[PDB]
């Protein structure tokens, strides 16, 4: 599943935990953003094995079948 | 009476009139202060050389009054009443520094002492409690 | 209950300084304080974040938007802490 986030981070990851706050424990984690000081165009993404996440960050979660 | 870790740990610690530590023949073992002081008072000791410091990012004021400083290995450096004798011995201060005091050092009476300091340590704005002026 | 709150309450009467989220420092006699740091102050100067200062009478401030409060150093002595 993919998650949109406040800081422009598309978090494509496998969900493990879930709560009232929409905090999440994540496996198989693959974030997507862009380190870019203007004018520039770069698209970057990194793999992380295991990752805890805070809920205020979360804007919209989505499920791609 | 070596400057030791144990010595530093029982030393008066307070907020001065900045965080200051109240303090010896050789400056050593400063690691134990843990870079927690803005000022260190080393007045009235027997240090010969201003050297031996660890990396101390906090330290902005060094009061080194009435010691025996004859050689130099930070915004304010007070060296009043020490033993610096040659203009060339003050050269290492060019690599630092806005407030500098070297009064009561033999070097003071050397011809052109003030102009020499000003040209070699241009970052100093107040020298011996007098404003470095443009002229 | 919060000891900082208590301290603030104690500081009532005294001339506290007071910066907000905006970064607009005030100084004045602390008239009233509440559990939520809802401060009122008298005879209060008001510095702009850029620099300029403005005198004003009886300012109210809501603790939410308060950043930090400076209290006079006499309160250090006694007798809230122990």
């Amino acid at each position: 599943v993919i998650i949109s986030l406040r800081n422009n981070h598309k978090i494509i990851a496998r969900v493990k935990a879930f709560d009232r706050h929409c905090n999440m424990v994540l496996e198989n984690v693959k974030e997507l953003w862009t380190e870019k000081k203007g004018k520039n165009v770069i698209n970057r993404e990194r793999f992380i094995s295991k990752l805890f996440l805070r809920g205020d960050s979360v804007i919209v979660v989505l499920k791609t079948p | 009476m070596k400057f030791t870790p144990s010595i530093v740990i029982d030393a008066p610690q307070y907020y001065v009139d900045d965080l200051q530590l109240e303090t010896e023949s050789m400056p050593s073992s400063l690691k134990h202060l843990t870079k927690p002081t803005h000022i260190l008072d080393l007045t009235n000791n027997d240090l010969i050389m201003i050297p031996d410091l660890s990396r101390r990012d906090d330290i902005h004021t060094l009061l080194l009054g009435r010691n025996n400083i004859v050689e130099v290995d930070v915004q304010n450096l007070t060296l009043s009443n020490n033993s610096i004798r040659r203009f060339e011995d003050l050269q290492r201060l060019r690599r630092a520094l806005k407030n500098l005091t070297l009064i009561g050092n033999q070097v003071c009476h050397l011809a052109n002492y003030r102009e020499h300091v000003l040209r070699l340590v241009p970052h100093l704005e107040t020298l011996d409690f007098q404003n470095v002026t443009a002229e | 209950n919060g000891i900082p709150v208590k301290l603030l309450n104690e500081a009532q009467g005294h001339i506290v300084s007071l910066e907000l989220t905006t970064g607009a420092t005030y100084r004045g006699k602390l008239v009233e304080s509440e559990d939520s740091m809802n401060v009122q102050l008298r005879d209060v100067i008001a510095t702009e974040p850029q620099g300029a200062v403005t005198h004003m009478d009886q300012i109210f401030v809501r603790g939410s938007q308060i950043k930090f409060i400076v209290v006079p150093d006499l309160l250090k002595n006694a007798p809230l802490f122990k």
Binding site: - | D18 | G2, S17, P72
Partner: protein
């Protein structure tokens, strides 16, 4: 610095403190809170303009936890 468990156990230690605006408050923690508000004994706000450390001595300061980011130990007691 010592290897503490909590903040409460390290009361009265000289503290570096960061806040959301980017200022750095330094001073001894006199008292803590349920919401991490800090009383600081001899507080100095240290700020950095967009160069080199600007410095302001405050005094006894109540500091709101909302704005607090993180606290670090500057030195030992006394």
């Amino acid at each position: 610095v010592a290897h503490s468990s909590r903040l409460a156990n390290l009361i009265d230690y000289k503290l570096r403190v960061l806040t959301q605006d980017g200022r750095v408050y330094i001073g001894q923690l006199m008292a803590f809170d349920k919401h991490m508000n800090l009383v600081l004994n001899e507080c100095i706000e240290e700020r950095v303009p967009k160069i080199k450390v600007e410095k302001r001595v405050l005094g006894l300061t109540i500091l709101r936890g909302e704005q607090i980011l993180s606290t670090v130990v500057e030195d030992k007691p006394l």
